[PDB]
Amino acid sequence: MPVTINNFNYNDPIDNNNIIMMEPPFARGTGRYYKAFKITDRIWIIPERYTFGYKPEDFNKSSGIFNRDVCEYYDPDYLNTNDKKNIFLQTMIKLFNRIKSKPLGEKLLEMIINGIPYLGDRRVPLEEFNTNIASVTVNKLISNPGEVERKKGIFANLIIFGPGPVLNENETIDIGIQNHFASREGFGGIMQMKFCPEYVSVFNNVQENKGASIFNRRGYFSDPALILMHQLIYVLHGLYGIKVDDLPIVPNEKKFFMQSTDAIQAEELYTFGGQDPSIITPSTDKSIYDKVLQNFRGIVDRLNKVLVCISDPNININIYKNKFKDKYKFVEDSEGKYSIDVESFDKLYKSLMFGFTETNIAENYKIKTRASYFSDSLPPVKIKNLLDNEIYTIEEGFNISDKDMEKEYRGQNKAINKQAYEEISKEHLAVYKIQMCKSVKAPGICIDVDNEDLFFIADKNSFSDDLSKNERIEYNTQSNYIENDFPINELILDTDLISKIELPSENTESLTDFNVDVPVYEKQPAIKKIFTDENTIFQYLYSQTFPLDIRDISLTSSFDDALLFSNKVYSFFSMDYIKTANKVVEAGLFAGWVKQIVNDFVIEANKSNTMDKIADISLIVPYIGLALNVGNETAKGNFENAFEIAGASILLEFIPELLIPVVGAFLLESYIDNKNKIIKTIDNALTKRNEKWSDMYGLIVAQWLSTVNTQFYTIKEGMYKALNYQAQALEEIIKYRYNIYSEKEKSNINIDFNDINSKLNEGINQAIDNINNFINGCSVSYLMKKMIPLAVEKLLDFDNTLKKNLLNYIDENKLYLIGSAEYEKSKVNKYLKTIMPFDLSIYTNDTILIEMFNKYNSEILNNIILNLRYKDNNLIDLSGYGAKVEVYDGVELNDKNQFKLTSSANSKIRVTQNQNIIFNSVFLDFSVSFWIRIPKYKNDGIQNYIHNEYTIINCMKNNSGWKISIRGNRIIWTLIDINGKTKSVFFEYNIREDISEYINRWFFVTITNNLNNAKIYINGKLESNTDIKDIREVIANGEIIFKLDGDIDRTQFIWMKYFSIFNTELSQSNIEERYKIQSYSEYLKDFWGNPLMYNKEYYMFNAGNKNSYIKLKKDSPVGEILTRSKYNQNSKYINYRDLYIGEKFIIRRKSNSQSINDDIVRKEDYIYLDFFNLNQEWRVYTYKYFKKEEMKLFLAPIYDSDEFYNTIQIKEYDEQPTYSCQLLFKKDEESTDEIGLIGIHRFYESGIVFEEYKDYFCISKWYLKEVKRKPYNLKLGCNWQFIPKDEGWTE
Predict the structure, then answer these.
(1) Distance between CA atoms of 22 and 154, rounded to whole angstroms?
(2) Rounded distance between C-alpha atoms, residue 605 and residue 985, angstroms
(3) CA distances from 1212 to 337, 935, 1103, 1270, 1274 (A)
(4) Which of 643, 668, 881, 996 is most solvent-facing, going by the fewest CB within 10 Å?
(5) Gap between the Cα atoms of 916 and 914, Å rounded
(6) Quick check: is 501 in a domain?
(7) Burial of 578 by CB count in 10 Å (0-12 exposed, 13-18 middle, 19+ buried)?
(8) At what angle do helices 282-305 and 342-353 cross, to 10 degrees?
(9) Is 758 helix (H, G, I), strand (E, B) or coil?
(10) 1244: enclosing H helix or E strand
(11) Pick from 139, 235, 132: nearest CA to 189
(12) Do 809 and 865 have their domain in common?
């Protein structure tokens, strides 16, 4: 039969059957009875204020509190009269009907009703049903008081009292005697409950978006009749007796900003559900499991031993034995002897522990609840009337589809309903506050902070170290890993407990001994003063807030001034924003000023890709340090620089000390002489090692989740608060500016505040989205980088020791006992090689962590191993792992990451790596990318060109590795194989073809090998490929040393720019992006790729013609174009074109010619390109009003016209990187429109000597298409390459 609610009023006469006057167990024998109603059998409601342990004066509000976590509300005038008691009882009936509606409520019930507590705790022999114990029975009055008093015994399972002296507090107390509890040792007892239906908690969410664009009423409130099932699941645990006590999670209190909280056991963590039960280590899980199993076996022994009761003759035997067997799910043998089935007990334990939880109940009932135990909270709000059927419907609840609210959880939104659910005045709320004040005796600055805002950091005393126990293993031992996931189909298969037997009656004899212990509660002070000077969130969020009674303010960027003056506020935005906000305008431009300041606020709050630079950083929020200052004072300096040089470890202000004990070795002393069972022991040892790997990973994950995410969530909450405060301050300032003036401007220009409020809220929402994404990525990066390697090191050492021990054992015993051994030698040599990969999907289930972990792992810029970059005249790895580099300050290098390597031993770079990261078993898969410049041959050393072999990059550690060699016109990549053979990759440049653009030029090279193929990229394309299909099984273990390692001529020096080695697959669509990112630059390029320089000798080169230059004759000053020649010296071995030809285009200025001062780079600079010929000065001239066609520029004598603007402009006209420039001679400065397009014209120049047929490159309207469609300009007369002279190139 389904559970049935009995409906009746409060003034009904005492029937002594359904409305009795019992005595609560904690009342002992005082003699003050209480009326009590029953809803369902063994579920007694008793409406009255809980007064067992509290003083009568305790109820009124005082300066004290009870517990240091929750915020409390006092009220003495609750449940005063019969009307209030009747309303309480009606609300209880309504809530129970709401619970009974859904099938899951019926499953939760019918389980705390049919579960009868065992008769008698351990202080009784194994053959007695000692009914006279305070944890079983209570006494009820039969006769009307005054002449005759009788007491009869009545059973119970749950007694629901009223609220305590604090309405918010709800608890489920149990019964225990002489400091020993029968509710934990598999027995169970009657339990009480405290409750109040009206008041409910108010929570909030961050990731999601609120329905309304307002923060006056924000968040949600918890639905009544769902707080109740939390207490009922606690009651079910206590009643079934599995409320085992074990290691708590103590909050650390060794610092001045730590949270103070009472210890919390696993009972409060196993029922809240979600990701919280994952901070409970599997060792503690198995310990609890074993304790529960042992207790149940003990009760099996007691139940099989008991045979007669000597207290109440009315009690039967066989029916009670059958009922207890049904309750505990035992197995009855044909001889009447009970037992325990391991699978049945495991199923029961999982169903009772993981099967029911608050998150699952909320998801089933479609009710909004919090995300985790460690989360935000808000002051509570009451409900005006829970009985009015227009507000709360027992079929749906707060989400009535009639009023169009069953969507997006609209029913429980505080802002949208806003009318039927009053708030609670803060004139009676008492909270635990901490007063943080400066070291000075009287600073005038003493800040208050709630205890609910500080950082919660766990302590290392709360994590067990069962890994270090010496383990004995034999062929009969298999260890089962207990899961932490509940399939909801268990209850479906159970199907409403059809097989349960009807419970026996509740009429037994009365009790005699009623001695039982009762708790005593005491108040605490609510003020705690500490002296601190380390500025943090608690010191910035207060300075960002202005007093309520002030009217006019003015933002400023001085935190010291913000603390000193209450008039000003602190703003971490830009100085232009501060100036705009401080500006004062007139009535004419008020609307324009308002729009401008709102747009500026939105743009300033929306920033995600600041300082787009070649560096490998995806996203960053550049005002977190300026707004919060969390860590080692990240506010000062550059947050971007600090992040890029310190990794993700700079935000946190307390680095946890990990607990990674060394795991104990195995004791495989089974000593089986025959029956070849040693293989079973070996396999069991391997499985046990796997389980220990899993346990260590779980421990690391639990500690991470307990500390790091908590601190980062506090950071995110502070960010939300700061942004909201800034928006509110801006709106208040705008309102004051509007209100300052008289009615004239109000009538002339009209504006409403709702539009600007909505715009500001939208901006805040977008900014919070970006900040949340950044913080989540940072947290996952820290987890994957700074914690796992230590664990994998410890497990690798343990694996080595275990392999040695197993090898010694097998050699000493089994090698002689059994001939066949090579199979298990191969097993112990191969299986113990590969490590178990990490995977968060096994140790966590909720999508919030998994999705961002997957995104981080899919990201390609988070897989750097050996990020080599220049930073402060030193080489520091930017990968974040931390590698030791040995260099001195004597050497001098350019800032833009330039390395020069030669045969001299003076230049020495030593790198020691932390190659203990999760290893790559397959290997044969990586990439190496770098930028090279190589010298040129000087027609000397044919042996050097042909025979010589040299290299600068190598990895030779265990006589098998890989290296990259460079020859004269060759690129080689050699890898070694354990067998003896070697595979090599060859590439070369054509030099007899007379076409070359790589020689003495920067060139990007990438080598990428996978299991299938090894590929070479030099320009983003494939030219030469060869197969590496052979399985090499050679892994790079040692260091890589950068040196030629050969004493040769000093004339050779190799230039290197950017070394990056990836252990990740780089197949395609990433190499080209890397090329573009690392080659993109604002400045201009030389012939080879160096920055364009001033006062540098230059010569003409264009891709249109291979032989053209400008030369001025030594005898006579005439400049013109002649054809180029080859090298004058004859050399049949090799030949090349001539380069050091023509006249220089030096930028010589008489005012500043030597020691030019550092200037400021500006786009489209005004540069004059004129050269000097000894004492003759030339002038570049063009006839302003030219009427001819194809007219050359004039090299004229000196003219006294310099104030006129005949400047030359330089730019680019192609998207992809190149080595060329675009020159322009703009005669009119304000020519905002295009004067003309490109024109290549065949021209018969009117030369006196001869009519030269040239291809002149002028501004003509005959080739509009090229520079109108704007492709990548590679071939044109608009190249104008500037080729300097340097000692690297020998004439």
Answers:
(1) 9
(2) 52
(3) 94, 29, 16, 11, 11
(4) 996
(5) 6
(6) no
(7) middle
(8) 120
(9) helix
(10) strand 1238-1245
(11) 235
(12) no
Backbone angles phi, psi at 27, to 5 degrees: -70, -15
Paired tokens of 83: 């009307």
34-40/19-22 β-pairing: antiparallel
Residue 1013 lies in a domain: yes
Task: Report the amino acid identity of residue 1091.
Answer: P
Could you tell me if 731 and 555 are in contact, meaning their C-beta atoms sit under 8 angstroms apart? no
d(CA 105, CA 361): 9
* 894 shares a domain with 788: no
- Alpha-carbon distance of 120 to 128, in angstroms, equals 8
* Residue closest to 1004 by CA, chosen among 1016, 991, 986, 987: 1016
Sheet strand arrangement including 527-531: 446-450, 433-437, 527-531
386: nearest Cα among 378, 397, 396, 401: 397
Q: Tell me, yes or no, whether 823 and 868 share the same domain.
A: no
Whether residues 887 and 813 share a domain: the answer is no
Q: Contact, 1066 vs 927, CB < 8 A?
A: yes
Structural domain includes residue 517: no
Please give the residue range of the domain that contains residue 1008.
Answer: 847-1079
Single out the residue in 390, 419, 439 at which a domain terminates.
439
List the one residue out of 977, 980, 931, 970 whose CA is nearest residue 950.
970
Residue 1232 lies in a domain: yes
Report the sign of the C-alpha dihedral through residues 209, 212, 218, 224, in that order: negative
| Co-location of 815 and 878 in the same domain | no
Q: How far apart are CA 468 and CA 1156, in angstroms?
A: 70
Go through 463-477 and write b for each residue having 16 or more CB atoms within 10 A of its CB, e for each that does not. Answer: bbebbeeebebebee
Q: What contacts 437, CB < 8 A, 6 or more positions away?
A: 443, 445, 446, 447, 529, 530, 531, 532
SS3 966: strand
- Residues 680 and 608 grouped into a single domain: yes
Residues in the chain: 1291
- 8 A C-beta contact, residue 34 and residue 48: yes
- The structure tokens listed for 112 are 């705390």
Residue 799 near residue 661, CB atoms below 8 Å:
no
Question: Are 786 and 878 members of one domain?
Answer: no
Tokens for 655? 């680095």
**How many CB atoms are located within 10 Å of the residue 239 CB?**
27
- Provide the token pair at 1074: 């890397």
The angle subtended at Cα 446 by Cα 441 and Cα 450, nearest 5°, is 140
Phi-psi region of 611 (alpha: psi -120 to 50; beta: other; left: phi over 0): left
DSSP 3-state of 152: strand
Inter-residue contact 888 to 882 (CB < 8 Å): no
Residue where a domain stops, chosen among 1046, 1079, 1112: 1079
Contact between residue 764 and residue 727 where contact means Cβ atoms under 8 Å apart: yes
CA distances 34 to 193, 197, 1209, Å, are 16, 21, 99
Q: Tell me the C-alpha distance between 882 and 868, whole Å.
A: 11
Encode 1197-1221: b = buried (16+ Cβ within 10 Å), e = exposed. eeeeeeeeeebeebeebeeeebbbb
DSSP 836: P
What is the stated resolution of the deposited model, in angstroms?
3.6
DSSP state of 1054: E
DSSP one-letter code for 814: I
Residue 1230 CB coordination number (10 Å): 6
Task: Say if residues 634 and 651 touch (Cβ distance below 8 Å).
Answer: yes
Q: Are 130 and 118 in contact (CB under 8 A)?
A: no
Quick one: 810 and 853 in the same domain?
no
Q: Are 239 and 113 in contact (CB under 8 A)?
A: no
Number of domains in the chain: 4
Q: Which two tokens stand for residue 201?
A: 């908690």
Q: Find all residues with CB under 8 Å of 615, minimum gap 6, and list them.
A: 644, 869, 878
The answer to whether 232 and 112 are in contact (CB under 8 A) is: yes
Q: How far apart are the first and last CA of the chain?
A: 106
Q: How was this structure determined?
A: cryo-EM
